[model samples]
Target: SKNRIKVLRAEHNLTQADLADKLDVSRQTINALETGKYDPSLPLAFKLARLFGLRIEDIFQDEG
Candidate 1:
């Protein structure tokens, strides 16, 4: 899986810590998402899409 979380965060002037706070997750989790080391759960992914005002597909994609 690949996600645009890092790029979106950068564009929004959010640090990993800041985004982690907003998402109610750990900084390490944010890092993991950004690095494709982990994929978010369904509810978490919905939260992320809502936070960014984007569709899930807009932020995350199949690494085909």
Candidate 2:
């Protein structure tokens, strides 16, 4: 799976730590999520959407 965390961050000019502070998550979480190991688990997904005004579907998609 691939997630748009990095892509959208680039679009918005946001850093991993920058978004981490906004979402009150840690840099590790954002970095790992961007690494695409897993989906943003529920509320994290919502926070991300709210952060970007985009939905989870837009941020996360898997070809398989």
Candidate 3:
């Protein structure tokens, strides 16, 4: 999965730590996510999507 997590965070003026706290994850998790290291659970995706006021698909794109 390719995610625009970093872009969305910057757009909302949030850092990794802030969003991690908000989303109940850790800094490493958020960092790794933006760095395109791992594809995590869909539940977490829901949390992120809700926080950013976007659909999960808007944040993360599956490569065709």
Candidate 4:
């Protein structure tokens, strides 16, 4: 339904809380993102992309 943030987080040795801190968001926000309950803002998405050293499309994709 969304990005592979949960799997990537584990691969990067980061908990949701840790990712939230890095992204300057709440842990719940990270959880929401992982669960596809929310989509990140463009800036947030870019930040995530940079953090993972990936392109935004590499981290996120259209469900269609």
Query: lDDT: which candidate is best?
Result: 1
Candidate that beats the other on lDDT, 1 or 4, i.e. the better one: 1
- Please write out the lDDT profile of model 2 over residues 19-45, one tens digit for every residue: 999999999999989887656788998
Runs in model 2 deviating more than 4 A are none
Least accurate 10 contiguous residues by lDDT in model 1: 55-64
Regions more than 4 Å wrong, model 3: none
Weakest lDDT window of 10 consecutive positions for candidate 2: 32-41
CA RMSD of all predictions: 1.2, 1.6, 1.0, 1.0
User: What lDDT does the true structure give each of the candidates?
Assistant: 0.94, 0.87, 0.91, 0.93
lDDT of 4 by residue, 1-64 (tens): 5798998999999999999999999999999999889989999999999999999999998766
Error of 2 at 49 (Å): 0.8
What is the lDDT for 36 in model 3?
A: 82
CA lDDT of 59 in candidate 4? 93
**TM-scores of the candidates in the order shown:** 0.94, 0.87, 0.93, 0.93
Task: Kindly state the number of residue pairs that clash in model 2.
Answer: 0
**Alpha-carbon runs more than 4 Å astray in model 4:** none
lDDT of 2: 0.87
- Which parts of model 1 have CA positions greater than 4 angstroms off? none
